[PDB]
């Protein structure tokens, strides 16, 4: 669990050896058997969404979109684990290849298309450990459930309001995710009447769940939107009383510099090229809500001072996924060192108070 070993040899060998999403395959399956082998300090405890996190650092949604990992991936060191995207039926996604890695330039390019399990399986398997879930919960590991849409339904509204009644009982909170660039029409409901409508009915279903039963909603955003639209997110997040803001999802611009053979790969692009584009998202959304509402930011994020930039920027809570894909598990307690020597050595008492600092500069 030697970052060099796992940096330099076991993952250059498992990235020549399979093609990428068979090695995303075989890494969901080992994590599930708990065939893997850092103790969080209190600075890193964050209190949000109602719940307490013992650290910052979660993986981000695509890794597990069935809930397979759950256990294993808290066993890794995240502090809070999001599966998904899960849509309402099953459906397979798009034709492989859909997977490609842009070693060069630290970065992926993916075009799944919401392949998921559904709701109903994802339902049984959460409810299987469902009362284990809620001790980890409560000593400060908690479950977000990221929902989708299914590729031909005909009332999108409709498919992540059934999302909220199926999984919403099982989860400390929902992410609307409007912001996967693979799946066709989907990004248009980050548009203000969409997205108020959508939210609107998306939050009556919530508030129809028990107490106990009854997660925090978050929207999750693309890294590509204009100006205006994000305004207008803002703006209807307040206006709704959203719990969260998740940011960024992939981006579909490719950055001028990317050197990988496959950069004009269509797909949703993740890794380093994308780590400022979504900070400097996180930064906008933070102040267009005036610091109220929870950020959890995930994009590129590979290091310590990659998350205390998001943290600083705004962000409560950060994500990754595409790191792991190179440095192998090791990153996770990589992140959380660096980020804590970085909190010390900056003056904040804990995360807490690095939260949205560039703001107050
Ligand atoms: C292979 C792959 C599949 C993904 N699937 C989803 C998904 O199902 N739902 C979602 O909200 N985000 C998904 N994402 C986006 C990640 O959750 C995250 O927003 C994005 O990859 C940026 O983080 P990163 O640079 O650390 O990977 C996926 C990303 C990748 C790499
Ligand atoms: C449990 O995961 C591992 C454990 C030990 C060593 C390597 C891994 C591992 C291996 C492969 C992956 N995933 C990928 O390589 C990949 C690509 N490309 C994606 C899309 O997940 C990940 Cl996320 C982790
Ligand atoms: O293709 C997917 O399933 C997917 C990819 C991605 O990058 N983001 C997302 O939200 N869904």
Same mark, same amino acid.
């Given at each position: 669990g030697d970052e060099r070993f796992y940096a330099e040899h076991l993952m250059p060998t498992l990235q020549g050896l399979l093609d990428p999403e068979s090695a995303h395959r075989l890494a969901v399956r080992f994590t599930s058997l708990g065939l893997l082998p850092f103790q969080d300090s209190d600075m890193l405890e964050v209190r949000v969404l109602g719940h307490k996190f013992r650290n910052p650092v979660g993986i981000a949604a695509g890794?597990?979109?069935?809930?397979?990992?759950?256990?294993?991936?808290?066993?890794?060191?995240?502090?809070?684990?999001?599966?998904?995207?899960?849509?309402?039926?099953?459906?397979?996604?798009?034709?492989?290849?859909?997977?490609?890695?842009?070693? #060069?330039?630290?970065?992926?390019?993916?075009?799944?298309?919401?392949?998921?399990?559904?709701?109903?399986?994802?339902?049984?398997?959460?409810?299987?450990?469902?009362?284990?879930?809620?001790?980890?919960?409560?000593?400060?590991?908690?479950?977000?459930?990221?929902?989708?849409?299914?590729?031909?339904?005909?009332?999108?509204?409709?498919?992540?309001?059934?999302?909220?009644?199926?999984?919403?009982?099982?989860?400390?909170?929902?992410?609307?995710?409007?912001?996967?660039?693979?799946?066709?029409?989907?990004?248009?409901?980050?548009?203000?009447? #969409?997205?108020?409508?959508?939210?609107?009915?998306?939050?009556?279903?919530?508030?129809?769940?028990?107490?106990?039963?009854?997660?925090?909603?978050?929207?999750?955003?693309?890294?590509?939107?204009?100006?205006?639209?994000?305004?207008?997110?803002?703006?209807?997040?307040? #206006?709704?009383?959203?719990?969260?803001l998740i940011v960024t999802n992939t981006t579909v611009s490719r950055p001028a510099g990317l050197q990988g053979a496959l950069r004009s790969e269509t797909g949703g692009l993740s890794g380093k090229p994308l780590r400022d584009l979504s900070t400097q998202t996180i930064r906008e959304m933070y102040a267009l809500t005036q610091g109220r509402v929870p950020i959890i930011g995930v994009g590129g994020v590979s290091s310590g001072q990659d998350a205390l930039e998001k943290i600083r920027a705004g962000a409560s809570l950060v994500q990754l996924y595409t790191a792991l894909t190179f440095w192998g598990p090791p990153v996770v307690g990589k992140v959380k060192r660096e980020l804590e020597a970085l909190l010390k050595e900056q003056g904040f008492g804990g995360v807490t108070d690095a939260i949205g600092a560039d703001h107050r500069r």
């Amino acid at each position: 669990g030697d970052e060099r070993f796992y940096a330099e040899h076991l993952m250059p060998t498992l990235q020549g050896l399979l093609d990428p999403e068979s090695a995303h395959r075989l890494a969901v399956r080992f994590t599930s058997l708990g065939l893997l082998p850092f103790q969080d300090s209190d600075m890193l405890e964050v209190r949000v969404l109602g719940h307490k996190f013992r650290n910052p650092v979660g993986i981000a949604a695509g890794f597990d979109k069935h809930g397979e990992a759950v256990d294993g991936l808290y066993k890794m060191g995240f502090g809070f684990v999001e599966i998904g995207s899960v849509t309402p039926k099953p459906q397979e996604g798009n034709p492989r290849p859909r997977v490609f890695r842009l070693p #060069e330039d630290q970065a992926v390019i993916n075009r799944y298309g919401f392949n998921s399990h559904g709701l109903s399986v994802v339902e049984h398997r959460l409810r299987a450990r469902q009362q284990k879930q809620a001790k980890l919960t409560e000593d400060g590991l908690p479950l977000g459930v990221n929902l989708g849409k299914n590729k031909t339904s005909v009332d999108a509204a409709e498919d992540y309001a059934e999302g909220v009644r199926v999984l919403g009982p099982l989860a400390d909170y929902l992410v609307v995710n409007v912001s996967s660039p693979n799946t066709a029409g989907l990004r248009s409901l980050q548009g203000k009447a #969409e997205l108020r409508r959508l939210l609107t009915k998306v939050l009556q279903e919530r508030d129809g769940l028990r107490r106990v039963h009854r997660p925090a909603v978050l929207v999750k955003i693309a890294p590509d939107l204009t100006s205006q639209d994000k305004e207008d997110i803002a703006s209807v997040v307040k #206006e709704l009383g959203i719990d969260g803001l998740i940011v960024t999802n992939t981006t579909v611009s490719r950055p001028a510099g990317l050197q990988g053979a496959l950069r004009s790969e269509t797909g949703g692009l993740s890794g380093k090229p994308l780590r400022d584009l979504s900070t400097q998202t996180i930064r906008e959304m933070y102040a267009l809500t005036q610091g109220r509402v929870p950020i959890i930011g995930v994009g590129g994020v590979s290091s310590g001072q990659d998350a205390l930039e998001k943290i600083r920027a705004g962000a409560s809570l950060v994500q990754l996924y595409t790191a792991l894909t190179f440095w192998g598990p090791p990153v996770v307690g990589k992140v959380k060192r660096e980020l804590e020597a970085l909190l010390k050595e900056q003056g904040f008492g804990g995360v807490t108070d690095a939260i949205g600092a560039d703001h107050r500069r």
